[PDB]
Design a protein around this motif. Structure first.
Motif, PDB file in Angstrom:
ATOM      1  N   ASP A   1       0.749  -1.123  -0.128  1.00  0.00           N
ATOM      2  CA  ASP A   1       0.136  -0.082  -0.136  1.00  0.00           C
ATOM      3  C   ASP A   1       1.155   1.139  -0.204  1.00  0.00           C
ATOM      4  O   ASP A   1       1.410   1.529   1.163  1.00  0.00           O
ATOM      5  N   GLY A   2       0.865   2.048  -0.992  1.00  0.00           N
ATOM      6  CA  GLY A   2       1.684   3.317  -1.032  1.00  0.00           C
ATOM      7  C   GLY A   2       0.956   4.606  -1.242  1.00  0.00           C
ATOM      8  O   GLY A   2       1.706   5.642  -1.452  1.00  0.00           O
ATOM      9  N   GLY A   3      -0.183   4.588  -0.647  1.00  0.00           N
ATOM     10  CA  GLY A   3      -1.110   5.839  -0.318  1.00  0.00           C
ATOM     11  C   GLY A   3      -0.243   6.842   0.411  1.00  0.00           C
ATOM     12  O   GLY A   3       0.530   6.525   1.464  1.00  0.00           O
ATOM     13  N   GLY A   4      -0.355   8.083  -0.126  1.00  0.00           N
ATOM     14  CA  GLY A   4       0.407   9.246   0.315  1.00  0.00           C
ATOM     15  C   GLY A   4       2.162   9.147   0.371  1.00  0.00           C
ATOM     16  O   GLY A   4       2.860   9.770   1.086  1.00  0.00           O
ATOM     17  N   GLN A   5       2.687   8.056  -0.580  1.00  0.00           N
ATOM     18  CA  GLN A   5       4.015   8.060  -0.716  1.00  0.00           C
ATOM     19  C   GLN A   5       4.280   8.331  -2.060  1.00  0.00           C
ATOM     20  O   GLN A   5       3.295   8.357  -2.802  1.00  0.00           O
ATOM     21  N   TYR A   6       5.551   8.289  -2.272  1.00  0.00           N
ATOM     22  CA  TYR A   6       6.055   8.441  -3.847  1.00  0.00           C
ATOM     23  C   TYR A   6       6.903   7.389  -3.907  1.00  0.00           C
ATOM     24  O   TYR A   6       7.629   6.840  -3.396  1.00  0.00           O
ATOM     25  N   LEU A   7       6.821   6.877  -5.553  1.00  0.00           N
ATOM     26  CA  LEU A   7       7.048   5.598  -5.740  1.00  0.00           C
ATOM     27  C   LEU A   7       8.255   6.154  -6.921  1.00  0.00           C
ATOM     28  O   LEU A   7       7.872   6.489  -7.785  1.00  0.00           O
ATOM     29  N   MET A   8       9.376   5.861  -6.798  1.00  0.00           N
ATOM     30  CA  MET A   8      10.549   6.251  -7.524  1.00  0.00           C
ATOM     31  C   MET A   8      11.414   5.233  -7.935  1.00  0.00           C
ATOM     32  O   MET A   8      11.504   4.280  -7.226  1.00  0.00           O
ATOM     33  N   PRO A   9      12.364   5.375  -8.916  1.00  0.00           N
ATOM     34  CA  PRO A   9      13.139   4.481  -9.334  1.00  0.00           C
ATOM     35  C   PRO A   9      14.189   4.392  -8.095  1.00  0.00           C
ATOM     36  O   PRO A   9      14.400   5.303  -7.181  1.00  0.00           O
ATOM     37  N   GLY A  10      14.513   2.988  -7.879  1.00  0.00           N
ATOM     38  CA  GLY A  10      15.514   2.728  -6.840  1.00  0.00           C
ATOM     39  C   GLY A  10      16.968   3.753  -7.162  1.00  0.00           C
ATOM     40  O   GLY A  10      17.280   3.595  -8.262  1.00  0.00           O
ATOM     41  N   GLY A  11      17.491   3.966  -6.267  1.00  0.00           N
ATOM     42  CA  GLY A  11      18.929   4.695  -6.216  1.00  0.00           C
ATOM     43  C   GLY A  11      19.779   3.913  -6.896  1.00  0.00           C
ATOM     44  O   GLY A  11      19.907   2.603  -6.581  1.00  0.00           O
ATOM     45  N   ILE A  12      20.902   4.559  -7.734  1.00  0.00           N
ATOM     46  CA  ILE A  12      21.951   3.950  -8.053  1.00  0.00           C
ATOM     47  C   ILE A  12      23.184   4.629  -7.793  1.00  0.00           C
ATOM     48  O   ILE A  12      23.403   5.859  -7.976  1.00  0.00           O
ATOM     49  N   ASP A  13      24.116   3.984  -7.005  1.00  0.00           N
ATOM     50  CA  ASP A  13      25.371   4.718  -6.560  1.00  0.00           C
ATOM     51  C   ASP A  13      26.381   4.416  -7.231  1.00  0.00           C
ATOM     52  O   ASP A  13      27.007   3.032  -7.005  1.00  0.00           O
ATOM     53  N   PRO A  14      26.854   5.121  -7.835  1.00  0.00           N
ATOM     54  CA  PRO A  14      27.906   4.580  -9.059  1.00  0.00           C
ATOM     55  C   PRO A  14      29.346   4.796  -8.568  1.00  0.00           C
ATOM     56  O   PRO A  14      30.342   4.558  -9.167  1.00  0.00           O
ATOM     57  N   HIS A  15      29.438   4.939  -7.447  1.00  0.00           N
ATOM     58  CA  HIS A  15      30.809   5.184  -6.592  1.00  0.00           C
ATOM     59  C   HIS A  15      31.123   4.607  -5.320  1.00  0.00           C
ATOM     60  O   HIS A  15      30.883   5.102  -4.148  1.00  0.00           O
TER      61      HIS A  15
ATOM     62  N   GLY B   1      22.807  -0.223   1.532  1.00  0.00           N
ATOM     63  CA  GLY B   1      22.297   0.737   0.607  1.00  0.00           C
ATOM     64  C   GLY B   1      20.771   0.442   0.342  1.00  0.00           C
ATOM     65  O   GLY B   1      20.100   1.590  -0.057  1.00  0.00           O
ATOM     66  N   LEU B   2      20.270  -0.706   0.427  1.00  0.00           N
ATOM     67  CA  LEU B   2      18.858  -1.117   0.383  1.00  0.00           C
ATOM     68  C   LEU B   2      18.023  -0.573   1.349  1.00  0.00           C
ATOM     69  O   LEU B   2      17.232   0.220   0.858  1.00  0.00           O
ATOM     70  N   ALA B   3      18.495  -0.548   2.704  1.00  0.00           N
ATOM     71  CA  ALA B   3      17.897  -0.090   3.561  1.00  0.00           C
ATOM     72  C   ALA B   3      17.434   1.707   3.293  1.00  0.00           C
ATOM     73  O   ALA B   3      16.655   2.198   3.739  1.00  0.00           O
ATOM     74  N   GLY B   4      18.611   2.399   2.559  1.00  0.00           N
ATOM     75  CA  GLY B   4      18.568   3.445   2.477  1.00  0.00           C
ATOM     76  C   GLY B   4      17.791   3.999   0.879  1.00  0.00           C
ATOM     77  O   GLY B   4      17.875   5.062   0.413  1.00  0.00           O
ATOM     78  N   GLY B   5      17.316   3.062   0.306  1.00  0.00           N
ATOM     79  CA  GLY B   5      16.480   3.150  -1.008  1.00  0.00           C
ATOM     80  C   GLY B   5      17.492   3.064  -2.217  1.00  0.00           C
ATOM     81  O   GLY B   5      16.744   3.408  -3.279  1.00  0.00           O
ATOM     82  N   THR B   6      18.631   2.673  -1.846  1.00  0.00           N
ATOM     83  CA  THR B   6      19.478   2.361  -2.978  1.00  0.00           C
ATOM     84  C   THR B   6      19.409   0.837  -3.456  1.00  0.00           C
ATOM     85  O   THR B   6      19.811   0.004  -2.724  1.00  0.00           O
ATOM     86  N   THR B   7      19.380   0.773  -4.581  1.00  0.00           N
ATOM     87  CA  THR B   7      19.213  -0.565  -5.364  1.00  0.00           C
ATOM     88  C   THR B   7      20.231  -1.134  -6.043  1.00  0.00           C
ATOM     89  O   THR B   7      20.113  -2.314  -6.570  1.00  0.00           O
ATOM     90  N   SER B   8      21.078  -0.341  -6.663  1.00  0.00           N
ATOM     91  CA  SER B   8      22.291  -0.957  -7.287  1.00  0.00           C
ATOM     92  C   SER B   8      23.544  -0.005  -7.191  1.00  0.00           C
ATOM     93  O   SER B   8      23.487   1.210  -6.998  1.00  0.00           O
TER      94      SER B   8
END
Ligand SMILES: [Zn+2]
Ligand SMILES: [Zn+2]
Ligand SMILES: [Zn+2]
Ligand SMILES: [Zn+2]
Lengths: 479, 478
Positions: free
Chosen positions: A45-59, A82-89
């Motif tokens: 359930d994502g009511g009142g939230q924003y759904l974004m691409p997961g973060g990519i940390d290139p460094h 990284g996952l805990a912080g919204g970073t996916t790759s």
């Protein structure tokens, strides 16, 4: 199969809209208002939230052996945090020793990274040169999914590449359709100031910034930029910390040159007073290169983000615990360089950039994934909410709150450069390859779940370069 | 003694009507209607402008270089200068790698003895060791040298790399000496040169392609930032590009002492000259940095007008056709250099003063006084003041001259401004109080010029010293 995020506002690098999103088999399967739920598909359930691409940390530098030692964060802990912080790759670095085979260092690194909980890739560093290195680079691009090569302009007598190398390597990158990347600090100047400060008896962390002031970055950025212009290549500069280096990037872009710049949250938000903290270990905690800078540099970097002259965010995630830092208790030049950031990047940027009105939500997405994917030819596979894209996503609660601390963070390191900072706007859920891997406090990363991600060569910038090079071809005069 | 009567005196900052008396090498008096001492020669300057004689801080008289020796020697070059209003030079001692600087220096003093007018030397740092460093100190303390040149190009010849630049600039600071730089990235030049030759582009049209403007901009950036980091001033020779000029303006905009030099060539010629269908003509223009696309000319003029470029010079380095022809199958072996000592002042007056780009005062600043101030020769030189050296030029704003290799006094068979006609010319030139050029009659004599010593610690060093002191690194106690 199968995960449906329902009720959210989808936010991309360019628009916002209300939709549901369906993931299956690691991919985004459908997006639309009121999607139907496949049977037994889990529902977030994502009511009142924003759904974004997961973060990519290139460094990232997961478990890097560096400055007498080995980073505290391994590929698993790192990629989990990284996952805990919204970073996916992530994109990390293979850094061979000088005279060491690149394919050898590359298979060694793939080894170390197999334990990753999330998608990963590598840049390969060019730490020496030979016809063999030229050959191996071609193979890494042709056979191993590498399309970006790193050059260190500092770290003299260690891994520093001088002009003759940079030129040869950049030319190679042009031949292969690969992106040159650079750590821009003038190595002779750093080496020279380090010796001189130590000879004066200044051995504390407060001497670290002094050993490498902003114009040393500015110089090296100018030089990497002009070698790229001269060879007809693009260029990506890692962790810009200075006004001087930013101005060089803006100047080159202002002439039509493809130059990209990356920035770290620490360089947006911290200044060089941190190195003067009374407690040695605190001060040492901040030591990385380039170091944190006088305040006027933060404002300049913000504007670089606002103006399109800085392009990506990253962390230079390179963790060293206190006992490792204290390797340089008597000599700042032997404190292992690096700070933690993977888990904190997205929230730090959202809170300082979006809440303040410096950045739109869309720029937030551009700066946290999409620009990185576009530069490294991962778009629209990554950094994109569309049908067919990798199901790497983050669900963001704009009213959630978090207090950054080394005590509570998922990063395996005993120091946080933003200790005690409280942010508004946090990732409630993170989804990697279709799976819910962080859920309101629950981390569910597992070793070895991540894939190695190949990046194809020749991003489209090389088509434009190609046409220019052709149009600019030299013509003999006849006599 | 020589009295100049009836002229308007024009300095770097004002004009006024007065006569000027010289004797014993020096200016003795200045004032309206001065008395004539008995025996005194009188030069009538009515209708003309009396200015300091020009100082050309960048010459290479009889330089052995690129397999040969410059065609112009210290006598012919300083005599040609005087016909052109230039009364003193600064040339370069260029020791080979591993050669003693002192050795080279005395050799060059020998070569320069024959000069017709006053001369001095920068010394080039073409290699590094503790002995070079020691020698720099003796050059400054005993030999009147206060500036050292570093070449960032000419790989596998006289090129200095970062480690040498850093160590030398640091030695410069220690001695109160001004570092000067030839800013081209040698590695890029060398790479482009081979690539071009490998593609069979062996003609002069490839010289400019082998060192495009950003190669200069890069190296100016790097010299500038090394200077900033070590706490020295910096002087960059013959700036030809917007890119380098922008690096200088950037640094001066942060309060950094950086000076730039420009040649008339680079203000007025564009890179189309290298595509001339006659090989020998195209080759006549071959120098480094090469002439550039037109946009750079305008940027350079604006540097002059904004105070981001400071001096003019010529890089006077002459090679005749047969010499230039050593590169007939390989542009990279064409000896690099053009003539200009004779023409500098009229080129600039004509292009800058007649057009209203520059005032006459700026013209003086850029032709003598700024050079003097930078290299610690003001007010001995570049100044019309009692006790200054009597090096003066009388300028006819109405005269006209047409530049040509057939008529110039420069001992070379090519002039990069062949056929150009300028308005405003030196009618007379006075060096050491003596009338050495008088409307077409050149009276230069071998050996008349003096070696001119320049003291260390120009004034900028006092300012840098106060800065350094305020930024003492300070340890945190714990
Ligand atoms: Zn780095
Ligand atoms: Zn790094
Ligand atoms: Zn030069
Ligand atoms: Zn020269």
């Amino acid at each position: 199969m199968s995960l449906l995020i329902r009720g959210a506002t989808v936010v991309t690098h360019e628009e916002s809209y209300r939709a549901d999103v369906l993931c299956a088999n690691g991919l985004i399967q459908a997006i639309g208002e009121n999607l139907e739920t496949p049977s037994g598909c889990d529902v977030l359930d994502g009511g009142g939230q924003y759904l974004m691409p997961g973060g990519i940390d290139p460094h990232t530098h997961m478990q890097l052996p560096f400055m007498g030692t080995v980073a505290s964060e391994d590929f698993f802990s790192g990629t989990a945090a990284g996952l805990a912080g919204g970073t996916t790759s992530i994109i990390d670095f293979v850094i061979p020793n000088p005279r060491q085979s690149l394919l050898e260092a590359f298979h060694t690194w793939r080894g170390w990274a197999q334990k990753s909980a999330a998608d990963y890739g590598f840049h390969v560093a060019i730490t020496w040169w030979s016809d063999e290195v030229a050959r191996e680079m071609g193979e890494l691009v042709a056979q191993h999914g590498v399309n970006s090569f790193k050059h260190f302009m500092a770290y003299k007598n260690a891994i520093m590449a001088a002009d003759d190398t940079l030129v040869a390597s950049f030319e190679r990158c042009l031949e292969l359709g690969a992106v040159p990347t650079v750590h821009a600090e003038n190595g002779e100047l750093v080496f020279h100031l380090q010796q001189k400060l130590l000879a004066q008896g200044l051995t504390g962390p407060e001497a670290h910034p002094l050993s490498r002031p902003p114009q040393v970055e500015g110089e090296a950025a100018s030089r990497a930029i002009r070698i790229a212009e001269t060879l007809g290549t693009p260029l990506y500069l890692v962790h810009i910390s200075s006004r001087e280096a930013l101005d060089e990037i803006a100047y080159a872009r202002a002439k039509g040159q493809p130059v990209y710049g990356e920035v770290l949250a620490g360089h947006l938000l911290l200044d060089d007073s941190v190195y003067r903290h009374p407690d040695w270990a605190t001060a040492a905690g901040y030591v990385m290169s380039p170091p944190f800078r006088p305040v006027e540099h933060q404002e300049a970097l913000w504007r670089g983000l606002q103006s399109g002259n800085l392009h990506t965010t990253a962390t230079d995630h390179c963790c060293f615990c206190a006992e490792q830092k204290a390797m340089g208790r008597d000599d700042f030049s032997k404190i292992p360089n690096g700070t933690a950031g993977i888990e904190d990047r997205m929230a730090l940027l959202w809170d300082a950039g979006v809440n303040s009105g410096r950045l739109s939500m869309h720029e937030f997405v551009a700066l946290t994934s999409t620009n990185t994917a576009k530069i490294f030819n991962l778009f629209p596979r990554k950094g994109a909410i569309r049908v067919g894209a990798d199901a790497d996503l983050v669900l963001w609660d704009p009213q959630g709150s978090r207090t950054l601390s080394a005590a509570t963070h998922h990063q395996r390191v005993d120091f946080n450069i933003f200790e005690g900072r409280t942010v508004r706007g946090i990732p409630s859920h993170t989804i990697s390859q279709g799976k819910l891997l962080w859920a309101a406090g629950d981390l569910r990363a597992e070793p070895g779940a991540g894939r190695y991600v190949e990046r194809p060569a020749y991003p489209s910038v090389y088509e434009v370069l190609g046409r220019r090079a052709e149009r600019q071809r030299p013509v003999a005069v006849e006599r």
